[PDB]
Design a binder for these strands. Sequence first.
RNA 1: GGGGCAGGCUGGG
RNA 2: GUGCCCAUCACCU
RNA 3: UGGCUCUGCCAACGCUACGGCUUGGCGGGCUUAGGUGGUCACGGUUCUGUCCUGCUUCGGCGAACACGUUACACGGUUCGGCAAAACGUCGAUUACUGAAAAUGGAAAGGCGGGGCCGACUU
Lengths: 122, 111, 111, 110, 111, 328
Amino acid sequence: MEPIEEATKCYDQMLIVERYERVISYLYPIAQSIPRKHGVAREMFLKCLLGQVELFIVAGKSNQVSKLYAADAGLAMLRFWLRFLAGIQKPHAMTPHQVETAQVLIAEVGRILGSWIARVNR
Amino acid sequence: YDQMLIVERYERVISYLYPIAQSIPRKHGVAREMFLKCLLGQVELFIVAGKSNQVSKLYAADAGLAMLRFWLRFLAGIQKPHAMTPHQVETAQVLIAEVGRILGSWIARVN
Amino acid sequence: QMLIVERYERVISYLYPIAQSIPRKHGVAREMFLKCLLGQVELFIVAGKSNQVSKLYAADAGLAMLRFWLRFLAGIQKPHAMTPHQVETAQVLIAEVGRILGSWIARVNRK
Amino acid sequence: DQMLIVERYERVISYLYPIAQSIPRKHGVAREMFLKCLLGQVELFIVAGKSNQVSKLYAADAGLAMLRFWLRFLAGIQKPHAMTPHQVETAQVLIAEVGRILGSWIARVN
Amino acid sequence: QMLIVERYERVISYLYPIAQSIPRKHGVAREMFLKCLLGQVELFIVAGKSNQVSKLYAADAGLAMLRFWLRFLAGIQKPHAMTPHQVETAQVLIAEVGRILGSWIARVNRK
Amino acid sequence: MGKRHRNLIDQITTWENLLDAYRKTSHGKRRTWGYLEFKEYDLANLLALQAELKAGNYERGPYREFLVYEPKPRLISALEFKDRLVQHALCNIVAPIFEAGLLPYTYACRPDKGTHAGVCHVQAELRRTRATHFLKSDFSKFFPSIDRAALYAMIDKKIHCAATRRLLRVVLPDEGVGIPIGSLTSQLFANVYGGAVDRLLHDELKQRHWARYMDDIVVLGDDPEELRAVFYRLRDFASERLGLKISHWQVAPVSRGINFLGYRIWPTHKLLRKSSVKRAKRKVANFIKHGEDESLQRFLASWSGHAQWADTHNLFTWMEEQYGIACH
RNA sequence: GGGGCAGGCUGGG
RNA sequence: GUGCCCAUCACCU
RNA sequence: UGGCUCUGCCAACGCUACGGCUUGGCGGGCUUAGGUGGUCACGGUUCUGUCCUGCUUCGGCGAACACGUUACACGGUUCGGCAAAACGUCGAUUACUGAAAAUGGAAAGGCGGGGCCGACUU
Ligand SMILES: Nc1ccn([C@H]2C[C@H](O)[C@@H](COP(=O)(O)OP(=O)(O)OP(=O)(O)O)O2)c(=O)n1
Ligand SMILES: [Mg+2]
């Protein structure tokens, strides 16, 4: 059968994305819980959250470390969004527990991105 | 050939997915807009690819196809309202796979 | 440039009415089509100043994407928005701006 | 200098933003894109001034050019009239003033 | 310098409440202001992952644009005006981030 | 179930099964190249697999054979994810028509029976019966000596679906003498195979107090001469019929302790095995003088499960006194 | 003499 | 690599 | 999801090509599984302590401090009674049907306990 091959198979992009999918799967529900007001914040958060997948993916296929650092910047911005959604959003958006859970998941993707940046950097 | 063929095969993806992507509820509106920008914007990735033959351009056509498959996974996962039924992901993945094949052959032909 | 844009203005003036006829249902497709249509002017303009051929090929890609939008709006959009005739007429106008873009590409890569 | 151009462009915005909010919902995408062109050119100027590459000073010119396009486009967009011909004339004068300053600035850098 | 982000984050904490406040009427300005405000974090972040002064000047441009947004949102008229106080009492916050950005630009410029 | 079993390839390739097979194959493996290369076009992949199986054109990719020494010198042959999914899709229809014939007291790779339900069965069956003696036996090189041929005379009095049969025979050829270790398919067929000796214990031989866990077979008695008979009968059977040599056997009085399944099971206590202790003791000590006293809590929690069964109160006190760490 | 435990020293890692 | 248990983590019934 | 290229009405930031548009209210329309670990099925040599050096049914099992090798107390690892049924298994891919068991197809019976029913505990 031989599984339908994508071109430019990168382990690191595949792994990172599967692990980041867990971030999305955690955060997307709570990005959608952000009230109507805080809709622009939400749309921007969702574009950060769901759009980091593209950052990873493009990093994977176009092997250029620039794109890997862009992925890191995005993860950094996502970490900002957690801070923002917790603190600055006034109703609630993200319970302290949720930030603690999300940060763990993002940290896992952080690890993998770091390792990937490193293996490419050599 | 190549760009023309890929796009005509990808048009089938669009023709399948655009209806699906227009059905995604406003609740999942950012996901939808981003999925539509992924779906209808892959045509630009193909178009740029066959206007250069820079093989990096056909790899970012692959990245786009990869992102499109992410969107399928994601839209099948979202369970608030709901979107892409599992069947739709299956059907779409087959079509995207056909575009994938052609992209692969094209990557190879350039190699 | 100036003449490309004045010729593309005719595309816009033909297509924008067509793009506004696309029903609410296909509103995201419309917004995306209009951003392709009305936003190609920026592509032309930015090439006009920054004459780098990179910027000129992006203009070509945009025209190509606009041609895709014609195909898409004629058929893949389910109430086929653009009638086949409209695609034919639009393609003539786009072809005229295509010619000028081609000549401009050629003028730039003279050496 | 960025400060001068921006203060003169603020007058464009102050003239056009009211007018660009009056563009009918029918022409809603054109409007939002025109507003994003109008308030949005400020960023083009500002980036040009807080750095320097002259490409940024061209991108500011491109933006002014696009803004001019939007005026001509919105003037006679359809039966729902967006921008009256007079408004285009008045706006074009203001944009021309910022055009002049941009031109002089491009030249002073060149 | 990541006190930058954490001193900017009080700009955000001051400006975001009143940016969510901007009515639908001023909706494009709002979206663009919010994208300026919340998106300056990315400008800082990119600056700090590179320490290239280009990215540091882009961060400055963003702060400059944010200052523009304050002056713009002031004279937006009707009961929706960013009150003169808030323009000044945010200009103070942005100025603090400005100072740190300046020092950071300098630290990089005189390596 | 009426016997028969004549249309399993229809259920094996039901999409709803292959999706279960998929989720079972990927469970835990979701950071592997196999999952991640399959996950891409997962449902298009399963549609070409469903329809390879449904056609009879499935062919098992070669076993990638490595070997680890950390547990014990093994011979671990891995499979491609596609192949482990086909195996999981077989062993979802085919496993429960074998694992249902498996007598109660086989404790290996069958749901709701484990290592720990075995040691408990043994202890228990040791307490009741007031067993005086016991035969413990073991099969030499079990998997590498399974007939793959008289195996398919058991995979074949039960499958009766002549296409499941041909998929079983792709996933595991019907010729040779070596069921591959590191196949789901093979854990099953080894229990099934060694199920033949259970049915020469319980059926023939009328032995009612035993336990088999894969290749190890405890057989509590009361007359140690009978248990020696039983053993001779078992060995003769499993040699002549199954081509299994018995590596070690003994007929001990219940007093030496039945070194069964990681424990040493007297009627009354159930000390674990010194290896386990020493491995753990050393693991703990290492963790302490590695500054890894936080993964040690994970390990400790783990070993506190392997030892909650065993009479490891004194030993848990002892390890708490030596290092302080919260064992239980 | 052999053997188990914990440390010597050397490889694997 | 395969299964069985253990722990912990999310996550709703 | 601060929607709607969406209407009715009413106002007024405003803008009008004087038609409207916009914008604001105001109604209606459209809108358990998973993750991560970790158990069970790296040695080599001399040295220094330290301890063990039993058993065997001859297969092997041990031992050398888990030290009462054991929380010396049990886990529902309980105790009875059954074994009709269902389950398992042999009968059997048999009888039978039908050219052929061909992706039909039993049973009587035999064997189990895995099952059942109480008690007591869980
Ligand atoms: N890491 C492992 C170890 C064992 N097994 C399986 C296959 C084995 O055949 C079976 C029984 O385990 P044993 O420890 O008894 O090993 P063998 O059966 O190969 O015989 P022996 O122990 O005599 O070498 O468990 C496994 O899948 N993975
Ligand atoms: Mg063995």
